[PDB]
Write a protein that binds this ligand. Structure first.
Ligand SMILES: CO[C@H]1O[C@@H](C)[C@@H](O)[C@@H](O)[C@@H]1O
Ligand SMILES: CO[C@H]1O[C@@H](C)[C@@H](O)[C@@H](O)[C@@H]1O
Ligand SMILES: CO[C@H]1O[C@@H](C)[C@@H](O)[C@@H](O)[C@@H]1O
Ligand SMILES: [Ca+2]
Ligand SMILES: [Ca+2]
Ligand SMILES: [Ca+2]
Ligand SMILES: [Ca+2]
Ligand SMILES: [Ca+2]
Ligand SMILES: [Ca+2]
Ligand SMILES: [Ca+2]
Ligand SMILES: [Ca+2]
Ligand SMILES: [Ca+2]
Ligand SMILES: [Ca+2]
Ligand SMILES: [Cl-]
Ligand SMILES: [Cl-]
Ligand SMILES: [Cl-]
Lengths: 149, 149, 149
């Protein structure tokens, strides 16, 4: 009994793991995930940067970051409005870095941006043109999370 | 060995449970669930109130109920068309009650409504502009379920 | 007590099985699955027929198959563009069959189709107005999968 039931439950657990993996594949598919491409998702809610980071972190994802023009357009299409990107110069003013770490390898700054305007701007929002504008991390913009290809 | 295998399997199960909860959170988010707000969702199918109740119950949710103007707008945008709300005045005519219990707090009745028109109207539909109209429970309207925040 | 921990594990696993089933049901509901009806899903990606089959099969579904006009309309609404159907005449030219078996019954061919045009056309796409056109299986069209009622 004991050992047989124990061996069975290991197979029951592996079966459930396979099923959950499949469920995740189906949900990603219905969410628009393209083959071998990272995908972006939003609940269309606007909130401050820290809340977006906490929200995407919970979902085991990260705040959306475009690494090229294609991804930048992908994020733009998903958000439909201004959306925070996972990029900030909070550590050293004027020096933008990915929240995941490192200096920028691609950018699409609007003319004369980033400018740390007025009282200060350490976050970044992709606007309705695909262009970028640094803005207050306290302002509320659309939450867009990113998941791996 | 046995006690160690069992311990290791309990660990795997806990991990699977967390992963499943993550799948549920990502799904709700992708479908528009707002932070700290109830999750409203529909399959766009129209059916009698009894069927709507059975359907949401089977999903472990309940027929959508607007507790305030914010929730009412939320349900309105998810439904798109006329949809049943989890409210009826089946016990005492004129006394609308939530299917989950309690007297109606918030309401958004249309002019000249509720009117218990014709042979009687004990159910409620959110219609145009998000206003409410009492209607026959046997009539077919969109099924919108709600899940907790 | 080993036996008590084992019985609890059995209860934990069964609880997970029920919860995963609920997650699958809720996701299908959110994706538009109507009661007693099969449902269709797409990620809007365009690809050759063999890729669509492979992808749908992996999700334990199949390339969408319109068995009647209601389903055809449903597939048309989900796809939004030209999409492959789970129907081909690869086995015997001129004789269309479902990928899962059986000779084609209901059909919605555009005038003068199918025509096995040029070097040949053994696949089928639902196009404009929801009508059908036989096309090369090597061409890339929208991937739409169907799942059981
Ligand atoms: O130009 C500036 O306009 C302000 C309204 C604000 O958007 C700043 O971020 C811009 O740099
Ligand atoms: O006015 C009435 O019109 C009927 C057609 C029905 O919609 C009733 O519920 C309304 O109160
Ligand atoms: O008519 C034909 O036009 C070709 C361009 C191709 O679409 C064929 O499948 C059609 O039968
Ligand atoms: Ca600063
Ligand atoms: Ca700055
Ligand atoms: Ca700026
Ligand atoms: Ca009555
Ligand atoms: Ca009444
Ligand atoms: Ca009425
Ligand atoms: Ca042929
Ligand atoms: Ca010919
Ligand atoms: Ca042919
Ligand atoms: Ca043709
Ligand atoms: Cl700031
Ligand atoms: Cl009634
Ligand atoms: Cl072909």
């Amino acid at each position: 009994a004991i050992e047989v039931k124990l061996a069975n439950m290991e197979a029951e657990i592996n079966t459930l793991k396979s099923k959950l993996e499949l469920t995740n594949k189906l949900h990603a598919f219905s969410m628009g995930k393209k083959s071998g491409k990272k995908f972006f998702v939003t609940n269309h809610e606007r909130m401050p940067f820290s809340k977006v980071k906490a929200l995407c972190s919970e979902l085991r994802g990260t705040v959306a970051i475009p690494r090229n023009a294609e991804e930048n357009k992908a994020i733009q299409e998903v958000a439909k409005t201004s959306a925070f990107l996972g990029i900030t110069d909070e550590v050293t003013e004027g020096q933008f870095m990915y929240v995941t770490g490192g200096r920028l390898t691609y950018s699409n700054w609007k003319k004369d941006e980033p400018n740390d305007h007025g009282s200060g701007e350490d976050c970044v929002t992709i606007v309705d043109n695909g262009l970028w504008n640094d803005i207050s991390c306290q302002a509320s913009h659309t939450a867009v999370c990113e998941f791996p290809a």
